[PDB]
Design a protein around this ligand. Sequence first.
Ligand SMILES: [Fe+3]
Ligand SMILES: [Fe+3]
Ligand SMILES: [Fe+3]
Ligand SMILES: [Fe+3]
Ligand SMILES: [Fe+3]
Ligand SMILES: [Fe+3]
Ligand SMILES: [Fe+3]
Ligand SMILES: [Fe+3]
Ligand SMILES: [Fe+3]
Ligand SMILES: [Fe+3]
Ligand SMILES: [Fe+3]
Ligand SMILES: [Fe+3]
Ligand SMILES: [Fe+3]
Ligand SMILES: [Fe+3]
Ligand SMILES: [Fe+3]
Ligand SMILES: [Fe+3]
Ligand SMILES: [Fe+3]
Ligand SMILES: [Fe+3]
Lengths: 170, 170, 171, 171, 170, 170
Amino acid sequence: PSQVRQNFHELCEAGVNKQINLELYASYTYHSIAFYFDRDDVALPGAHKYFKKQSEEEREHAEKLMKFQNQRGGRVKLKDITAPEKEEWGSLLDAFKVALELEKKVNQSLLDLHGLADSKKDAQMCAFIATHYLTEQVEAIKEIGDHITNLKRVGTGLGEFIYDKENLKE
Amino acid sequence: QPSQVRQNFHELCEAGVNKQINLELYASYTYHSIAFYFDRDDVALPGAHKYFKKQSEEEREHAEKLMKFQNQRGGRVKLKDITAPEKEEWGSLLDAFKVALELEKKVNQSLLDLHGLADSKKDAQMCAFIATHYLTEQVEAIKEIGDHITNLKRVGTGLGEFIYDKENLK
Amino acid sequence: QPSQVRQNFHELCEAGVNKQINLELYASYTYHSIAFYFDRDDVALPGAHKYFKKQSEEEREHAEKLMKFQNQRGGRVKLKDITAPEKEEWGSLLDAFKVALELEKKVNQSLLDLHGLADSKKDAQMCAFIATHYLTEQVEAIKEIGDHITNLKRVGTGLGEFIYDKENLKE
Amino acid sequence: QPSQVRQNFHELCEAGVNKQINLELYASYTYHSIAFYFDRDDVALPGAHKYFKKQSEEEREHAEKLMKFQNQRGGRVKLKDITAPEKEEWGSLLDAFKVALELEKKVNQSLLDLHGLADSKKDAQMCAFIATHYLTEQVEAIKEIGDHITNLKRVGTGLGEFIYDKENLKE
Amino acid sequence: PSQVRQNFHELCEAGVNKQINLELYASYTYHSIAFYFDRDDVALPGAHKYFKKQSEEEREHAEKLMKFQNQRGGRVKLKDITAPEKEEWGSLLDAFKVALELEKKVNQSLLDLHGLADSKKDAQMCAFIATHYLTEQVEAIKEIGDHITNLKRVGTGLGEFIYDKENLKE
Amino acid sequence: PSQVRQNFHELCEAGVNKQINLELYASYTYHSIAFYFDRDDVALPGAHKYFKKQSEEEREHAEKLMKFQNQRGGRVKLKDITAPEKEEWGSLLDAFKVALELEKKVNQSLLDLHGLADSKKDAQMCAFIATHYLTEQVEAIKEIGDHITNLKRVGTGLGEFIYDKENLKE
Ligand SMILES: [Fe+3]
Ligand SMILES: [Fe+3]
Ligand SMILES: [Fe+3]
Ligand SMILES: [Fe+3]
Ligand SMILES: [Fe+3]
Ligand SMILES: [Fe+3]
Ligand SMILES: [Fe+3]
Ligand SMILES: [Fe+3]
Ligand SMILES: [Fe+3]
Ligand SMILES: [Fe+3]
Ligand SMILES: [Fe+3]
Ligand SMILES: [Fe+3]
Ligand SMILES: [Fe+3]
Ligand SMILES: [Fe+3]
Ligand SMILES: [Fe+3]
Ligand SMILES: [Fe+3]
Ligand SMILES: [Fe+3]
Ligand SMILES: [Fe+3]
């Protein structure tokens, strides 16, 4: 075993590797969404900028887990990053509904990971997940919630143009 | 018809937050009373006046942060009457701090109960929120009030109350 | 019996001030409720959340100024239960501002009554305090809310609500 | 019909760009793996960790510029799975830069093929794009990796690896 | 019972007092190691500086636990500080292996203390330990793992001089 | 024998090692006194700060002697640090009387060490001790004498609060 490994269970190591893959998957999906809004027949630059940023942040989420794996003396194990569900994402509202479903799936994954760590009495790993993931996920779901509400409010056409400029770009 | 953001948030936890919101508001109202008691012409302790107004304001912030939490998790804020404080007149500086210590310990037990409920429903995010934002401020507040009581017993009545008020509360 | 500072301050006027203090806190709590309703994920109007949060804080300040006045005059603050707000849910931006107009007019009438009472007891300093600090703020608040209602009717539902919230309430 | 912006852009060139995007992402993921390998407690080379993290990031930028180019020309981005890196463990600093040279040359050949395809369809825009942003960075990248390999052979294993990591990669 | 004491078990109070002694014992060991590297026949100034700093940090760890004891209304009980295991600590690599051993020993003590807190539903004591101690320890252990790896890599003689200058002095 | 050793007797080397232990024992006593004044039922923050600072200075005194040991080519030999004489230290005036006792005890130890140096014609060790230790000790003793006198003058209760604020906190 690694010289630094202490109170770190093989199932927890495995759970971190699974979460790294899911974070990379979310990153790639937002990347797809970002460049969909950059198409000449879509042309919502606020969404393009917003989802690009989201993609970057999800990559940082993966890196912090890779960093965590090494601190605890686990070994990073990488799998393929599955291509996103769709090639085209529809409206601003459609894209946000996809984002909410993705964020809730990631959140349930992190809640299962936390539960795993608690079951093995990994107090460090519980603290780490609670401090860096669980509140960002709640805040992210709430933010997407609000976007969906406002996108239904502003409607289609001019409303989308304005929401894109005022709320995603600025 | 669950909230679109709601995930791993029990109805009993929702109700527990609403109960804590009322308790925080109640504490704010009690400090407000105490603050204006020390502004009476026949009491006239400006340090205490300023101290307890600030305590009132902080308790209102504690309530707001739980209202914010309730909305983040997709629960619904339900407001009740704020009960008038226990007394119209609060006696000496020492008497007011003995009241505060009893209040803080009451609020603390309520936060420990609320944390216990969250843990019993495996609401790991709610555990972290309460630990991060409430449990250590409560411990620091109780210790601070203990030190105040100790010092108010030491300085005694009359000149000591005037000095303590100027040196430690103002 | 009376405070060493008390001069020309009738017990009915002392009682009137305690009743105004309660009304101010009641209005604070109502705006607080409204503020957190606009922060719900299924309403999500951040401009209104911010506006009503500030209104809540202001009304608490109006209560504090009265508690401070009570003590200046040597009256004694007497606090009562702060009644829960009328509604749990407040509907549209328009519905919320219509509630505010109603609330602000109720508070105004109460202050005008209190001023009446002060004058009936020839409490000139109390008349001056009420006129100086409350009667014009009240007039200005009711005008401001009237303008809000007019503009919320003009912009309509949907896009207009989003724009009004961002342009007028947030900024 | 075709995109309103599409002019002188062949479907095989579109396909080529999509294949290059996947390759750039593949390269990015490989450098990511290498980066975190050097962060292991039993490898502990902080310069190389920082260096390969930065290489991972730049490759992702290379991918983004081609997606941007795809949309500029009125083509459509088609994403495929990103294949996991070929190894879990990357050996020495020298071994890692040997993998990097192999990878950089493979990507260069794919860019030279893409350029040949552009020229074959008389896509002057695309030739110029590839030559301006890709062909020279790739030559510079290969030269840089070549110099790293030579220097890592010069310095030894052991002390030399620590010194090179701190003096050359941590910069 | 202290006026401030609430939800603080005697066994948790005892464990805090045990931890304080352990923190002070680590401090004294680091102090010894620091002054060994200052001997004219050892003369590694980077190590002297580094281990002095480690000695100072461990004393701070002890202080934070004494402060916590008082905050919770426990009473600080102090025991002899046992002299370090050796008078002489060998090579840079020998000293770092001692450090990894010590840090892993301390960490197990903190994981046990956290376990005790949890067994008594001391929610605030769990938060305290995880926030201030559990992640610091995992960072400390990883950093020492990294030192050992690099000290094996650089070898003895010239490598030790350079490591001491380039990594420990800076 | 150390390459650096010249005109340094074994008995002087032994006395330096004795002094180091005494400096560390004083440091630990001051640490105990410091954290007693931090208890919720004592709560004298000026004393807490003052005795913490004294604790830090005594550790520095120990360090300077370990440095001197190494400069002269003696070898540092460390012994257990004996727990302080009391767990509880009474009044501000009680703690200062303990301090005068401790400081006079240390000073006699330094005067004996100086005597030993002189008996071995260790001219540089006489200079070291007189320069760094003998006048500091006389200043320390006078300052504590002054505290005791002023603590008798101010009396208990209000006087202790004011002295703690006005003299020890500043
Ligand atoms: Fe994420
Ligand atoms: Fe890193
Ligand atoms: Fe996310
Ligand atoms: Fe509170
Ligand atoms: Fe808010
Ligand atoms: Fe409180
Ligand atoms: Fe008002
Ligand atoms: Fe005031
Ligand atoms: Fe108003
Ligand atoms: Fe590239
Ligand atoms: Fe772009
Ligand atoms: Fe490249
Ligand atoms: Fe420690
Ligand atoms: Fe302190
Ligand atoms: Fe440590
Ligand atoms: Fe000393
Ligand atoms: Fe030194
Ligand atoms: Fe001293």
